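Q: Predict the bound structure with MIB.
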Amino acid sequence: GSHMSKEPRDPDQLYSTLKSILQQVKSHQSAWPFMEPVKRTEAPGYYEVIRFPMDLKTMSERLKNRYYVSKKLFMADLQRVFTNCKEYNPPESEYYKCANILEKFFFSKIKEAGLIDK
Ligand SMILES: CC(=O)/C=C/c1cn(C)c2ccccc12
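A: Predicted complex:
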């Protein structure tokens, strides 16, 4: 019929698809606040604000073997990464910058892969 691009294709393609998005999002210069692991009190205001701390170092870990195969599961965590930084980081900081730049890249990429869910 026509072209709308707004629906994943089976868990097989979607699986590696999330693995590709992470490969780019993580490889993106604006991913160091999530790619590498963070300390425990190195973040200005952590634990007592982030209900579910998350980072890219954990996604690729499970996504590698078999975990983020769904569209909402991956989007939830990944989206939790961009907001988590934006959460404990003030309005003026490099953490938010790279998090807002990569987050923009993420939404666009998924917007084209008919992903996104919650
Ligand atoms: C994106 C996220 O959920 C958590 C990021 C950080 C957690 N900690 C403890 C940090 C310390 C420094 C910088 C970033 C973080």
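A: Residues 33-34, 38-39, 42-43, 46, 50, 53-55, 81, 84-85, 95 surround MIB (CB under 6 Å).
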